[PDB]
Amino acid sequence: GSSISNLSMQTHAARMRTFMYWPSSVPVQPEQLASAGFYYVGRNDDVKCFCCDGGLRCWESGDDPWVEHAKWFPRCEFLIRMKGQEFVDEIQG
Amino acid sequence: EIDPKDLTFLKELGTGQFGVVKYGKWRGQYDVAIKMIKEGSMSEDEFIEEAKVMMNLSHEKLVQLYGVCTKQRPIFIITEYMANGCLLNYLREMRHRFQTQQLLEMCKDVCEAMEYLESKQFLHRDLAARNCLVNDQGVVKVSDFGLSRYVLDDEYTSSVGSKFPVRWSPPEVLMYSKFSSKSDIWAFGVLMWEIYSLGKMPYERFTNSETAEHIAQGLRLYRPHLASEKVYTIMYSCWHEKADERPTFKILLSNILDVMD
Ligand SMILES: [Zn+2]
């Protein structure tokens, strides 16, 4: 019952350093992704959650990283702790 | 006109452009996709009339439109079920370990659908990997053909917009909104590039505004590593500054068949 998938990406700053070579074509900002537990894997617009290992790509204009996290990875321990169960079930509904 | 009672809804497929798309059954046990149109997203009266023209488009590499449900809201768009979804995601999934011959047939499939559309004088207006679909057999089919004509969202309509397909537009579209068979040819060349780049974003290190100014001064997409010198000559011919110097889909298809291995 492992809680964290990537310990080296537990801090917001560590997730921010991965976004150094983040393509300028992506219509979502590193700060918004890092806050939502995501780090850049170095290929295209692929991000991974440090807690649930949930991978997200093909980001569109107006995409909220917190909404997408709850949309595709609702069981994420980090997501529930930061946003609460109420927010998760709201996106699933 | 399909009766909504003669339709089943079994699984949700996605929430891309226009709204929610669901998998279900039609007459009795026919595999279908039901596109549900979100309120205020489409010039509805105009789409219903064009749907009658779209019903008559019938090709092996073109996503077949079986019918519509327009006597209720939301409007249902009943189509051919494509189990492997959008081409873009299909390309980005590295597990596939595609052969360059498989990448060429994806180009052949799109070019055949685009040759049929050109022979019917129908323009796609938004040709890209995100708008192509993949079926159970790995066959690529052209979808959402001419649909941008009915999108009400201001971000997708304006050339400097947040959702305009800038990276798939020729210089005359960005600068003067000059749409023609040649703007569909340009986008096809970009789509060929996306395929050989395994779903990489065109001009990834540029913003929409940087892309627009650089292509106008002759900057073109580099040769993808998987693309041979002969394959690159084909996609490159789509990007000629002069629209009349670009080939038709008929010429491109013979060019693609010429390098089949
Ligand atoms: Zn997570």
Q: What is the Cα B51 distance to its own chain's centre? A: 17
Of B163, B204, B208, the CB nearest to A23: B204
Domain at B4-80: CATH architecture: 2-Layer Sandwich (3.30)
> What three-state secondary structure class fits B62?
strand
- Do you know the residue count of chain A? 93
Residue B126 is a catalytic residue: yes
- In single-letter form, the type of residue at position B3 comes to D
Mark yes or no for CB contact A58/B200 under 8 Å: no
Question: What's the B94 CA to ligand 1 centre distance in angstroms?
Answer: 22
> What three-state secondary structure class fits B208?
helix
Please spell the DSSP secondary structure of B173-207, one letter per residue: HHHH---SHHHHHHHHHHHHHHHHTTSPPTTTTS-
B53, two tokens: 């023209």
A71, two tokens: 């949309």
A76, two tokens: 């994420």
> What three-state secondary structure class fits B222?
coil
Helices B100-119 & B181-196 angle (0-180, nearest 10): 170
Give dist(CA B259, CA B261) in Å, integer. 6
Domain at B85-259: CATH architecture: Orthogonal Bundle (1.10)
Of B3, B6, B109, B126, the catalytic one is B126
Residue B74: asked if its preceding bond is cis (omega within 30°), the reply is: yes
Of A24, A44, A61, the CB nearest to B207: A24
Count CB neighbours of B56 within 10 A.
9
* In contact, B10 and B24? CB cutoff 8 Å: yes
Q: What is the Cα B116 distance to its own chain's centre? A: 14
Helices B100-119 & B249-258 angle (0-180, nearest 10): 160
Q: Which residue in B43, B32, B68, B31 sits closest to B53, CA to CA?
A: B68
Task: Give A-chain residues touching B88 at CB under 8 angstroms.
Answer: 58
* In contact, B125 and B149? CB cutoff 8 Å: yes
Phi, psi of B219 (to 5 degrees): -70, 130
B interface toward A at CB cutoff 8 Å?
Answer: 88-89, 92, 130, 155, 162-163, 167, 199-201, 203-208, 210-211
| Pairs from B68-75 (Cβ < 8 Å, separation ≥ 24) | B68/B1, B68/B2, B69/B1, B69/B2, B69/B3, B69/B4, B69/B7, B70/B1, B71/B1, B72/B4, B73/B39, B74/B19, B74/B36, B74/B37, B74/B38, B74/B39, B75/B36, B75/B37, B75/B42, B75/B44, B75/B47, B75/B48
Phi, psi of B5 (to 5 degrees): -70, -30
Q: Where are the domains of chain B?
A: 4-80, 85-259
> What three-state secondary structure class fits B101?
helix
Q: What is the resolution of this structure in A?
A: 2.2
Q: Tell me which chain A residue has its CA closest to the CA of residue B207.
A: A25
B217, two tokens: 């001064």
Question: What's the B44 CA to ligand 1 centre distance in angstroms?
Answer: 39
- B16 labelled binding-site residue: yes
DSSP single-letter state for residue B227: S
B193, two tokens: 């590039």
- B190 labelled binding-site residue: no
Distances (CA, A) of B260 to A88, B3, B215, B231, B257: 49, 44, 30, 10, 5
